[PDB]
Structure 1
Amino acid sequence: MEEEEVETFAFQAEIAQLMSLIINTFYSNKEIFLRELISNSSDALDKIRYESLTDPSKLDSGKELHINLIPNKQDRTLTIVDTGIGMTKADLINNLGTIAKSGTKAFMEALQAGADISMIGQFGVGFYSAYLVAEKVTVITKHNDDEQYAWESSAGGSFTVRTDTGEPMGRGTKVILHLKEDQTEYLEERRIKEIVKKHSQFIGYPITLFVEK
């Protein structure tokens, strides 16, 4: 019989406001969520790549540097996996919700004046575009310094973090998007290919799309 510890965190006030704004307003051009998550994996892959030329053993639990897109039409999930640097516990809590982001207020002002959600990345809050298409997001991550953790949120002002006792990943981050009922086009291979081609073609790392069938 298992016992697992969970910790519940409140999103920083403006992050929570941004989150509600994302979820509760209609926005065209939602497909940009994919560009934001892939840029995040590309950034984490640059990170491990550079860290390793200083200390090669950092590639022990993780040699290949790439991105995998995994739609699941049974689960209604869309998973973006990278073999990037990953996140420590502190990186998860601070980076994903707890600490104020300096661009937050500016972006909301931008949006309320009619800006395209596409501008989100320039404001340092690109991760949150995930909520344009997903009702719940799960982040599984593994950094060399630590154990694997699972971050999770359905918005509402809180997120949870717990040590993951699930499939081990070695090193990297996996963003699992539990898609809203009406956002299932993001599970289709043709559309995923369309949006990567439109928005994500200068990634310095190979991206593979895995289609169940």
Structure 2
Amino acid sequence: EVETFAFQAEIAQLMSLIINTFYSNKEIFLRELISNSSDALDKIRYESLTDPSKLDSGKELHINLIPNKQDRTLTIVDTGIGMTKADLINNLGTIAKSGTKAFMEALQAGADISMIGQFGVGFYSAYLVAEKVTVITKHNDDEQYAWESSAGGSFTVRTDTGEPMGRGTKVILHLKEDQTEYLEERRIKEIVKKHSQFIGYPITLFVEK
């Protein structure tokens, strides 16, 4: 059972700008997604201080980067707080409405796309390199869900039946045909060293078979 939702007009407009604006510094997508993972891990670590049982779904707080040349996918896995169904459908887009308006006014005032993180909508930078994005997420208070969008103004949400995750978020980037450089180990290493060297969680870059 797959539910289809329309993006808010502002979010759909933001995704279209990201996809259609000529902008060569696409590598900032990884910094934005790692930053999102670090924030999600900060939240579950803080919540577990006053409630240790919140880590029953997993004590390890880490980030994994998994490239797959056969599927042409780059997966960013974290064991952070995860996202509920209400987050995927309502809460995140509601928060992102103000940030999108501020971001686009800034772009008209001379800012560039790499500053998208300062407006709270860095997740959508994934569409600089991905034609489709799948998000598998599990929050302690909800079920495991699969969020998916190839842009175009709509996204889907379903209950995920795949391998259980315990807790956290998995962002699967189905890369565009000309963006396969972000599957190479040397390239991912360079980006992490350049933009995410001081993230306070272990980042493990998986290598390919």
Contact 1:79 1:177 in 2 (8 A): yes
CA displacement, residues 25-84 of structure 1 (integer Å, 9 cap, x when unaligned):
110211000000001000010011011111111111111000000000000000000000
Q: CA deviation at 1:116?
A: 2.3
Contact 1:72 1:187 in 2 (8 A): yes
Contact 2:129 2:179 in 1 (8 A): yes
Q: Does 1:116 align with 2:112?
A: yes
Q: CA deviation at 1:111?
A: 2.6
2-side partners of 1:95 and 1:33: how far apart?
Answer: 22
Counterpart secondary structure, 2:74: strand
Using a 3 Å threshold, how does the CA distance of structure 1 residues 99 and 161 change in structure 2: closer, same or farther? Answer: farther
Q: CA deviation at 1:106?
A: 2.5
Q: CA deviation at 1:97?
A: 3.6
1-side partners of 2:34 and 2:138: how far apart?
Answer: 17
2-side partners of 1:96 and 1:186: how far apart?
Answer: 27
Contact 1:134 1:180 in 2 (8 A): yes
2-side partners of 1:78 and 1:71: how far apart?
Answer: 4
Counterpart secondary structure, 1:150: strand
The match for 1:192 among 188, 193, 209 is: 188
Q: CA deviation at 1:109?
A: 2.9
Shifted more, 5-14 versus 128-137: the winner is: 5-14
2-side partners of 1:100 and 1:192: how far apart?
Answer: 28
Contact 2:58 2:166 in 1 (8 A): yes
- Counterpart in the other structure of 1:13: 9
Contact 2:96 2:121 in 1 (8 A): no
Q: CA deviation at 1:99?
A: 5.5
- Counterpart in the other structure of 1:165: 161
Shifted more, 156-165 versus 109-118: the winner is: 109-118
Contact 2:96 2:120 in 1 (8 A): no
Let me know the Cα RMSD of the aligned residues: 1.3
Number of aligned residues: 209
Q: CA deviation at 1:105?
A: 1.9
Q: CA deviation at 1:191?
A: 0.5
Q: CA deviation at 1:100?
A: 4.8
Counterpart secondary structure, 1:136: strand
Using a 3 Å threshold, how does the CA distance of structure 1 residues 95 and 197 change in structure 2: closer, same or farther? Answer: farther
TM-score normalised by structure 1 residue count:
0.94
Counterpart secondary structure, 1:100: helix
Contact 1:101 1:124 in 2 (8 A): no
Using a 3 Å threshold, how does the CA distance of structure 1 residues 98 and 163 change in structure 2: closer, same or farther? Answer: farther
1-side partners of 2:170 and 2:160: how far apart?
Answer: 12
- Counterpart in the other structure of 1:201: 197
Using a 3 Å threshold, how does the CA distance of structure 1 residues 116 and 76 change in structure 2: closer, same or farther? Answer: same
CA displacement, residues 74-130 of structure 1 (integer Å, 9 cap, x when unaligned):
000000000000011111112444655212123223334553211100111100000
Using a 3 Å threshold, how does the CA distance of structure 1 residues 100 and 186 change in structure 2: closer, same or farther? Answer: closer
Counterpart secondary structure, 1:175: strand
Q: CA deviation at 1:155?
A: 0.2
1-side partners of 2:101 and 2:140: how far apart?
Answer: 34
Q: CA deviation at 1:8?
A: 0.9
Counterpart secondary structure, 2:96: coil
Q: For structure 1, which runs of at least 5 residues remain unmatched after alignment?
A: none
Contact 1:141 1:171 in 2 (8 A): yes
